[PDB]
Design an enzyme around this catalytic site. Structure first.
Site, short mmCIF file in Angstrom:
data_model
loop_
_atom_site.label_atom_id
_atom_site.label_comp_id
_atom_site.label_asym_id
_atom_site.label_seq_id
_atom_site.Cartn_x
_atom_site.Cartn_y
_atom_site.Cartn_z
N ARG A 156 6.53 25.10 7.38
CA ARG A 156 5.69 24.36 8.32
C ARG A 156 5.01 23.17 7.62
O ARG A 156 4.61 22.20 8.27
CB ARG A 156 4.64 25.28 8.95
CG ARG A 156 3.72 25.89 7.92
CD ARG A 156 2.70 26.87 8.48
NE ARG A 156 1.65 27.13 7.50
CZ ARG A 156 1.73 28.07 6.56
NH1 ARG A 156 2.79 28.86 6.51
NH2 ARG A 156 0.74 28.22 5.69
N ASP A 170 0.67 17.97 2.97
CA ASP A 170 -0.52 18.72 2.57
C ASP A 170 -0.62 18.98 1.07
O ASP A 170 -1.26 19.95 0.66
CB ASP A 170 -0.57 20.05 3.33
CG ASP A 170 -1.57 20.04 4.47
OD1 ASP A 170 -2.78 20.24 4.22
OD2 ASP A 170 -1.14 19.83 5.62
C1 LIG Z 1 -2.82 22.95 13.99
C2 LIG Z 1 -1.35 22.65 13.80
C3 LIG Z 1 -1.08 21.18 13.73
O1 LIG Z 1 -1.51 20.46 14.60
N1 LIG Z 1 -0.31 20.67 12.65
C4 LIG Z 1 0.08 19.28 12.42
C5 LIG Z 1 -0.75 18.20 12.70
C6 LIG Z 1 -0.32 16.88 12.48
C7 LIG Z 1 0.92 16.62 11.94
C8 LIG Z 1 1.36 15.20 11.74
N2 LIG Z 1 1.65 14.55 10.47
C9 LIG Z 1 0.74 14.43 9.48
O2 LIG Z 1 -0.49 15.03 9.60
N3 LIG Z 1 1.04 13.70 8.38
C10 LIG Z 1 0.17 13.58 7.23
C11 LIG Z 1 -1.02 12.91 7.23
C12 LIG Z 1 -1.76 12.85 6.05
O3 LIG Z 1 -2.98 12.16 6.07
C13 LIG Z 1 -3.44 11.56 4.90
C14 LIG Z 1 -1.31 13.49 4.91
C15 LIG Z 1 -0.10 14.20 4.90
O4 LIG Z 1 0.42 14.86 3.80
C16 LIG Z 1 -0.15 14.64 2.57
C17 LIG Z 1 0.63 14.22 6.08
C18 LIG Z 1 2.21 13.12 8.24
C19 LIG Z 1 3.11 13.21 9.24
C20 LIG Z 1 4.39 12.53 9.03
N4 LIG Z 1 5.23 12.69 10.09
C21 LIG Z 1 4.85 13.41 11.12
N5 LIG Z 1 5.80 13.47 12.15
C22 LIG Z 1 5.84 14.39 13.20
C23 LIG Z 1 6.77 14.21 14.18
C24 LIG Z 1 6.89 15.07 15.24
C25 LIG Z 1 6.02 16.12 15.32
N6 LIG Z 1 6.12 17.09 16.39
C26 LIG Z 1 5.35 18.19 16.35
C27 LIG Z 1 5.44 19.16 17.34
N7 LIG Z 1 6.33 19.00 18.33
C28 LIG Z 1 6.43 20.00 19.34
C29 LIG Z 1 7.13 17.91 18.36
C30 LIG Z 1 7.03 16.95 17.36
C31 LIG Z 1 5.09 16.32 14.33
C32 LIG Z 1 4.99 15.46 13.26
N8 LIG Z 1 3.74 13.96 11.26
C33 LIG Z 1 2.82 13.91 10.36
C34 LIG Z 1 1.78 17.67 11.65
C35 LIG Z 1 1.34 19.00 11.89
#
Ligand SMILES: *CCC(=O)Nc1ccc(CN2C(=O)N(c3cc(OC)cc(OC)c3)Cc3cnc(Nc4ccc(N5CCN(C)CC5)cc4)nc32)cc1
Length: 273
Positions: A156, A170
């Site tokens: 995840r 993370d």
């Molecule tokens: C409580 C569960 C939950 O909400 N988890 C969650 C939240 C947000 C993200 C999205 N992120 C993300 O947070 N990134 C990120 C940011 C950051 O800030 C400084 C640091 C990071 O690591 C050091 C990471 C990065 C990132 C990059 N790409 C994506 N892309 C993405 C595409 C699609 C989706 N979907 C999720 C769920 N569904 C149903 C469809 C699509 C999620 C993320 N996201 C993030 C992730 C998990």
């Protein structure tokens, strides 16, 4: 909340290595949900022309502690450096506006959901899976070289881009099933406990997004691990890759593979296939 309620402007120090002009940024639709603050898709110009990125900001009800956490995560990502298989910091907006932290976007979401959506009744062939495992091990090897202990390595927490590149999220800052015994019992975290977690992630990959220790409550995992319980071989997993998992779950941290060895071992399997 003093700082956020009291200041009309937030005078974070200007770091010219990372500061990104707000007018070259177009904020778009929200990304994921809202347990780790507010994250949105965006387009960034001249990172000439545009590219897709992800932007983290404070939720409109953020506390001073949320502010501190976003700043601290930003600062940690600055020090870690760039690598293909981690979510990289691309820029920050700290001057004359809301705090924005701009990182790489991963269009296909996290690895668990990517795998589960693509389960067979092919797409998740042996080579694809080994490639996932290999890419994550490369990222962890990088992080380890930067003296960064992840502490929560799980599928995840691995994100997948448009081109199926694995990117660990993370790294900058229920999880119990991914925790090494020394961390479970004595709250000790080392690179070798990340290796244990990587073993669990490996099992996650080859069960195509399966949930670890099925049927087992988190309360019993303590004694089960103590009694030497280990997960069995996934059906989609050749005995030699299972041997790798089992080695990652060695009780003795020194008898677990290093990430350097995991990369070399998985690279070999890839050349063969
Ligand atoms: C409580 C569960 C939950 O909400 N988890 C969650 C939240 C947000 C993200 C999205 N992120 C993300 O947070 N990134 C990120 C940011 C950051 O800030 C400084 C640091 C990071 O690591 C050091 C990471 C990065 C990132 C990059 N790409 C994506 N892309 C993405 C595409 C699609 C989706 N979907 C999720 C769920 N569904 C149903 C469809 C699509 C999620 C993320 N996201 C993030 C992730 C998990």
């Amino acid at each position: 909340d003093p700082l956020l309620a009291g200041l009309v402007s937030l005078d974070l120090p200007l770091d010219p290595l990372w500061e990104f002009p707000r007018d070259r940024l177009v904020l778009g639709k929200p990304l994921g949900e809202g347990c780790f603050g507010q994250v949105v898709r965006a387009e960034a110009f001249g990172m000439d022309q545009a590219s897709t990125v992800a932007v983290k900001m404070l939720k409109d009800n953020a506390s001073d502690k949320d502010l501190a956490d976003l700043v601290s995560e930003m600062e940690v990502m600055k020090l870690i450096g760039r690598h293909k298989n981690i979510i990289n910091l691309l820029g920050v907006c700290t001057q004359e506006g809301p705090l924005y932290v701009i990182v790489e976007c991963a269009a296909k979401g996290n690895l668990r959901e990517f795998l589960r959506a693509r389960r067979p009744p092919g797409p998740l062939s042996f080579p694809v899976l080994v490639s996932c495992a290999y890419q994550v091990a490369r990222g962890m090897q990088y992080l380890e070289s930067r003296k960064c202990i992840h502490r929560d390595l799980a599928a995840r927490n691995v994100l997948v881009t448009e081109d199926n590149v694995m990117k660990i999220a993370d790294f900058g800052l229920l999880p119990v099933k991914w925790m090494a015994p020394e961390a479970l019992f004595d709250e000790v975290y080392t690179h070798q406990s990340d290796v244990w977690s990587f073993g669990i992630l490996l099992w996650e990959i080859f069960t195509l997004g399966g949930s670890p220790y099925p049927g087992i409550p988190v309360e019993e995992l303590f004694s089960l691990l103590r009694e030497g319980h280990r997960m069995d071989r996934p059906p989609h997993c050749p005995p030699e890759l299972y041997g790798l998992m089992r080695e990652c779950w060695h009780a003795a941290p020194s008898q677990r593979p290093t990430f350097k060895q995991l990369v070399e071992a998985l690279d070999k399997v890839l050349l063969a296939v």
